[PDB]
Structures are given as structure tokens and as C-alpha cells.
């Protein structure tokens, strides 16, 4: 039963500071990698940066580095994300995500439900179509651009609406444990491709790709999938 569950966001104004706190349980806190994502509406996910628990080591999207500070309390299985200078631009859904190794140029296998705070050489990740509409039974392809080379160090994530995302295939091919055999992804290099061979009505959801061949960990824009 993981669980990764994110306090301390709210509404505070420009130039305020604002501590959240990531609490694990239900695996061994220190086996795995803590990253804080962010999502706001046009702005899609962003790396924000992630922690190595067992040493402490921590890699930051530059936009933010220095900024924003990540920590982590082994004792308390716990990860933090320190956010200062906040302005109108940092508005957005922090979500921590879980790691699964000792790198934190990486994708993650679990999400937390998310902390909202509001204040009143990147390798890009593109996705198309935006949105498409399609029914029941059908087959749908979906595709991810990288600016540059990345061998097969793409992730495919599912997000259903008021939900965290959720992974569904990792190393571009990989599908995650307990993702139904429905789902497949494709592609090497730049060029990659996510199928769904007959789609179910679960299925009706925005799906978003990810790179971890180098820093910053970029995303995607997103592809909203919807019902007829």
C-alpha cells in the first residue's frame, strides 16, 4: 500500500515563503527517490526537482534552483519542498512523486494527490493532436516528439480528471505493473508513440509523456483523449 500524501500549500501573496512536506509510507522511504512536480492549467507539469534520501543529493530544474529548496527527513520518511520569493507564476498543483532507483534523472512509479498553492538546451517534450475524440471499441496512437535524441528513456503517464497521474509505460516500452495489456508505446530516438488497441471507458483521460535522459526532467504539453 504506498501512499504519499503532501501538506502546508495555501494562498499567500507575492514575495511570501511556503514550506509543503511530502510524508511516505507503506515502503521503505530510503530505497527510493522523491521528486515535486508542479501542475497548473497552460503551464502543464513541470520538474521542480527531486531528492535522493540515502545521501541526501538533490538536482533541481534551473528556473527554480536556488529558489526552491528540497530536504528530506529519513526518521520521519519525509520530503520537503521549501518555496520562497513566490510570485503569480508559481500558482500551480505540488504534487511529490516516487523514484523507483538512485537517480534523480528519472520517472516515477507513484504520485502524491497533490498540495495546491496559490499567490495573489531544455529538451522539449511535444504532444499531438491537443485533444482527440474518439469512441468506445476503438484503436487510438498517440504521439511524443523530443527535441533531441533520448535512446528509449521515456515514460507515458495517465491522468484522470481530480487525479494524480498515474505511470503506464516507462523505457518507451515497458508497460507498469497492473497497466492492462490494452496499452502499448513505441519508439526510439526522438519519435515515440503510445497505443491504446480497443479503448474502454476508463480510458477517457489526458495522457502525458516525460524524458529522463537528461536534466531538467521535461514533459509534455499533454493529449486529452474524450468520448465520442
Known amino acids: 500500500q504506498v501512499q504519499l500524501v503532501e501538506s502546508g500549500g495555501g494562498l499567500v501573496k507575492p514575495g511570501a515563503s511556503l514550506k509543503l512536506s511530502c510524508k511516505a509510507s507503506g515502503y521503505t522511504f530510503t530505497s527510493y527517490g522523491m521528486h515535486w512536480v508542479r501542475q497548473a492549467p497552460g503551464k502543464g507539469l513541470e520538474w521542480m526537482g527531486g531528492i535522493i534520501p540515502i545521501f541526501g543529493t538533490a538536482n533541481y530544474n534551473e528556473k527554480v534552483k536556488g529558489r526552491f529548496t528540497i530536504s528530506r527527513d529519513k526518521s520521519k520518511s519525509t520530503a520537503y519542498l521549501q518555496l520562497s520569493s513566490l510570485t503569480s507564476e508559481d500558482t500551480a498543483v505540488y504534487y511529490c512523486?516516487?523514484?523507483?532507483?538512485?537517480?534523480?534523472?528519472?520517472?516515477?512509479?507513484?504520485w502524491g494527490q497533490g498540495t495546491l498553492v496559490t499567490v495573489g538546451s531544455d529538451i522539449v517534450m511535444t504532444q499531438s493532436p491537443a485533444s482527440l475524440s474518439a469512441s468506445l471499441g476503438e484503436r487510438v496512437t498517440i504521439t511524443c516528439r523530443a527535441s533531441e535524441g533520448i535512446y528509449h528513456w521515456l515514460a507515458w503517464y495517465q491522468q484522470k480528471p481530480g487525479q494524480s497521474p498515474k505511470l503506464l509505460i516507462y523505457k518507451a516500452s515497458s508497460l507498469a505493473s497492473g497497466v492492462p495489456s490494452r496499452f502499448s508505446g513505441s519508439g526510439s530516438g526522438t519519435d515515440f508513440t503510445l497505443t491504446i488497441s480497443s479503448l474502454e471507458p476508463e480510458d477517457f483521460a489526458t495522457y502525458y509523456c516525460?524524458?529522463?535522459?537528461?536534466?531538467?526532467?521535461?514533459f509534455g504539453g499533454g493529449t486529452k483523449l474524450e468520448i465520442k
Open positions: 516525460q524524458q529522463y535522459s537528461n536534466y531538467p526532467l521535461t
Open positions: 512523486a516516487r523514484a523507483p532507483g538512485y537517480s534523480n534523472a528519472y520517472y516515477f512509479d507513484y
